[PDB]
From a paper:
The nucleosome remodelling and deacetylase ([name]) complex is one of at least five corepressor complexes that recruits and activates class I histone deacetylase (HDACs) enzymes and directs their activity to chromatin. They serve as scaffold proteins for the assembly of the [name] complex. [name] and RBBP7 are WD40 domain proteins with a characteristic seven bladed β-propeller structure.
To understand the nature of the interface between the R1 domain from [name] and [name] we co-expressed and purified a complex between [name]-R1 (residues 464–546) and full-length [name]. The interface between [name]-R1 and [name] is extensive with a buried surface area of 2,837 Å2. Two of these grooves lie on either side of the long amino-terminal helix that forms an extension to the WD40 domain. The final interaction region C is composed primarily of helix H4 which binds in a third groove on the surface of [name] on the far side of the PP-loop.
Residue numbers in the entry:
A (entry chain A): 10 to 89, 103 to 163, 166 to 175, 180 to 211, 214 to 411
B (entry chain B): 468 to 518, 529 to 546
Write the structure that this text describes.
């Protein structure tokens, strides 16, 4: 629509003028092709005698005609009488490594044990693994993956037990590979878990428990699995989580029992593994479907979420059931901490910075990447 | 579209805290497409120049079960 896009463009200018009062950091950068994936690598280099530090990302490309690439880009984050410190990003966000990828990168995640190893989801059933040290940083204008793993966007390395990878296959099943101690380029599945009745969307390992992993699907269910159990056709638990397709899930990093799930019914549902019958809380506010949800690495009571709507909400669940004014009721519930209106299109993915608190990188279908930190006075009082 | 940088200056940082009543960060956080009164806080900050604990996850899960759906 020609009207709607004009109304989006004006609201971007409103947001852009408000950024000194709503943020401490904003770093917009237009990519060549739009990325469906984003994740901060855990390492950080502190260069000698500078006021910034080099953090790195794991990006992809989503293209039909031109050749797709697995991207890794550096980012300069600052260290610790005029208003509005605007400048111009130049040499802050730049591409370090480009590797040729067969088909579009729907998701890409680094291996916790060896951050050099990156698995990448494809539209097909297979998952390609890459080691960016092995490949050259300058690709010629031929894909060359280190491992091909035969079998939605789901992808998850296990933090415990190196080399164990999960993913949502195309036939309503969850594959499980074991790439540690391969004798051979191609690898086949160790286990195929067949519980869900519809398309599996996302799958995630439990953080403190080697055997536990959760999954979500279009059949409106949250299935908590156990790899040790012999019966692969039925999970340990099974909840009717939402009224629509459940697109994502994420476990809390500070509690073994707590997790969240996002769905197409415009709600993020909070859960507890000790009682899957009761739903703890349903975060309502989002204006469209939820496709991603992430907990803050630093703060246990903080989580963010994004999806089909151009806004990314940040939730502070320590404010649940606080006494608001009637003016603040119009804005939303008190557990909703911050709304990020920087993007002008569907936010495909985002990721919390593991080293610098409150810094988030988000990507979207309008070709742009935004590394940003909300204002200090919002989260602190 | 139009790439840009923002590192907020330390005068603007405490200008938000000094002008908390005019800015209303709790209101402004969930209203990104409302234009904030950029003139008023700049006037009051310069005119009035001379001058948090989070509660744990055990407490909120205890609250959520105590005040259920």
């Amino acid at each position: 629509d020609a009207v709607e896009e004009r109304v989006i463009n004006e609201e971007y200018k409103i947001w852009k003028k408000n950024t000194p009062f709503l943020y401490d950091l904003v770093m917009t950068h237009a990519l060549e092709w739009p990325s469906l994936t984003a994740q901060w690598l855990p390492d950080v280099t502190r260069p000698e005698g500078k006021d910034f530090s080099i953090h790195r990302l794991v990006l992809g490309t989503h293209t039909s005609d031109e050749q797709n690439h697995l991207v890794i880009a550096s980012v300069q984050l600052p260290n610790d009488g005029e208003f509005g410190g605007f400048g111009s990003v130049s040499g802050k966000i730049e591409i370090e490594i480009k590797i040729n990828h067969e088909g579009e990168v729907n998701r890409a995640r680094y291996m916790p044990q060896n951050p050099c190893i990156i698995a990448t989801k494809t539209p097909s059933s297979d998952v390609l693994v890459f080691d960016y040290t092995k490949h050259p940083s300058k690709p010629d204008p031929e894909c060359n993956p280190d491992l091909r793993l035969r079998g939605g966007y789901g992808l998850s390395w296990n933090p415990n037990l190196s080399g164990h990878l999960l993913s949502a296959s195309d036939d309503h099943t969850i594959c499980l590979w074991d790439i540690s101690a391969v004798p051979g380029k191609v690898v086949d599945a160790k286990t195929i878990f067949t519980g869900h009745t519809a398309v599996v969307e996302d799958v995630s390992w439990h953080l403190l428990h080697e055997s536990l992993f959760g999954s979500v699907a279009d059949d409106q269910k949250l299935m908590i699995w156990d790899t040790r159990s012999n019966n692969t056709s039925k999970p340990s638990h099974s909840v009717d989580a939402h009224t629509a397709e459940v697109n994502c899930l994420s476990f809390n990093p500070y509690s073994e029992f707590i997790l969240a799930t996002g769905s197409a019914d415009k709600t993020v549902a909070l859960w507890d593994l000790r009682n899957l019958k009761l739903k703890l809380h349903s975060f309502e506010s989002h204006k469209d479907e939820i496709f991603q949800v992430q907990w803050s690495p630093h703060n246990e009571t903080i989580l963010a979420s994004s999806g089909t709507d151009r806004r990314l909400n940040v939730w502070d669940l320590s404010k649940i059931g606080e006494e608001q004014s009637p003016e603040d009721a119009e804005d939303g519930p008190p557990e909703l901490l911050f709304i990020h209106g920087g993007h002008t299109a569907k936010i495909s993915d985002f990721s919390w910075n593991p080293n610098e608190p409150w810094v988030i990188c988000s990507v979207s279908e309008d070709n742009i990447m935004q590394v940003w930190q909300m204002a200090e006075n919002i989260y602190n009082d | 579209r139009q790439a840009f940088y923002l590192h907020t200056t330390k005068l603007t940082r405490i200008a938000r805290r000094l002008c908390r009543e005019i800015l209303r960060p709790w209101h402004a956080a969930r209203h990104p497409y409302l234009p904030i009164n950029s003139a008023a806080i700049k006037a009051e900050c310069t005119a009035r120049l001379p001058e948090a604990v989070r509660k744990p996850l055990e407490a909120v899960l205890r609250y959520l079960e105590t005040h259920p759906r």
